[PDB]
UniProtKB/Swiss-Prot annotation:
<comment type="similarity">
    <text>Belongs to the GFP family.</text>
</comment>
<dbReference type="GO" id="GO:0008218">
    <property type="term" value="P:bioluminescence"/>
</dbReference>
<dbReference type="GO" id="GO:0006091">
    <property type="term" value="P:generation of precursor metabolites and energy"/>
</dbReference>
<dbReference type="Pfam" id="PF01353">
    <property type="entry name" value="GFP"/>
</dbReference>
<keyword id="KW-0157">Chromophore</keyword>
<feature type="cross-link" description="5-imidazolinone (Ser-Gly)">
    <location>
        <begin position="64"/>
        <end position="66"/>
    </location>
</feature>
<dbReference type="InterPro" id="IPR009017">
    <property type="entry name" value="GFP"/>
</dbReference>
<keyword id="KW-0455">Luminescence</keyword>
<comment type="subunit">
    <text>Monomer.</text>
</comment>
<keyword id="KW-0599">Photoprotein</keyword>
<protein>
    <recommendedName>
        <fullName>Green fluorescent protein</fullName>
    </recommendedName>
</protein>
<feature type="modified residue" description="(Z)-2,3-didehydrotyrosine">
    <location>
        <position position="65"/>
    </location>
</feature>
<dbReference type="InterPro" id="IPR011584">
    <property type="entry name" value="GFP-related"/>
</dbReference>
<dbReference type="InterPro" id="IPR000786">
    <property type="entry name" value="Green_fluorescent_prot"/>
</dbReference>
<comment type="function">
    <text>Energy-transfer acceptor. Its role is to transduce the blue chemiluminescence of the protein aequorin into green fluorescent light by energy transfer. Fluoresces in vivo upon receiving energy from the Ca(2+)-activated photoprotein aequorin.</text>
</comment>
Length: 230
């Protein structure tokens, strides 16, 4: 299909986020590339407003689980790849991320091509955070666990929904759960694929650029669709 073909090679990615969490306003710019053939993403994010007022790990899904058109869909599962099917015109991705016993993020993003570049533009609003909670208190380890993203079709919206649980490691050894509810709807008028139930198996590694003095995050991520047998 048309959408599929856009992802056969390495595609440059731009991410732009504006956020307001409990009145802390901030912006982030990210750049990198994706290679859907291998389900592979490499991205570097920079907080352009100064210090990020929330922990970097709490934004990973928004920035990436943010560009799920880079997932590797096995050949036998290609009829289930909503994300690429919506391209180049793109999709709106909305989430509510509920941090257990703390606040929530509401995110609205548009993911689309601008020329040959895949762009993820996000607005994030966070409310109800506790001043000395794990988020505003910066008590989360700088690392990331592997998770499954459970996708179902949303025929009424010509799109999909997803549900999953992110577990952020707390510096005391405990875990901060971040429940994710997600909805995606196409922007353009092309045909899109409405998938059978399946999941994305996602693995992410966070690192720092030793030469970077701005507040930043380097992300390496692999994403593979699964849950449907050949």
């Amino acid at each position: 299909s048309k959408g599929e073909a856009l992802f056969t090679g390495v595609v440059p990615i731009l991410v732009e986020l504006d956020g307001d969490v409990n009145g802390h306003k901030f912006s982030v710019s990210g750049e990198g590339e994706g290679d859907a053939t291998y389900g592979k993403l490499t991205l570097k994010f920079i907080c352009t407003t100064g210090k990020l007022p929330v922990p970097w790990p709490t934004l990973v899904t928004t920035f990436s689980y943010g560009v799920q058109c880079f997932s590797r869909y096995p050949d036998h599962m290609k009829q289930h790849d909503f994300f690429k099917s919506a391209m180049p015109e793109g999709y709106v991705q909305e989430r509510t991320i509920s941090f257990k016993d703390d606040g929530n993020y509401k995110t609205r993003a548009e993911v689309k091509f601008e020329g040959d570049t895949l762009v993820n533009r996000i607005e994030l609003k966070g409310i109800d955070f506790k001043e000395d909670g794990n988020i505003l208190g910066h008590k989360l380890e700088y690392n990331y666990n592997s998770h499954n993203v459970y996708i179902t079709a949303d025929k009424q919206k010509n799109g999909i929904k997803a549900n999953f649980k992110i577990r952020h490691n707390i510096e005391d050894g405990s875990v901060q759960l971040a429940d994710h509810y997600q909805q995606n709807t196409p922007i353009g008028d092309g045909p899109v694929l409405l998938p059978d139930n399946h999941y994305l198996s996602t693995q992410s590694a966070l690192s720092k650029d030793p030469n970077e003095k701005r507040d930043h995050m380097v992300l390496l991520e692999f994403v593979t669709a699964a849950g449907i047998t050949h």
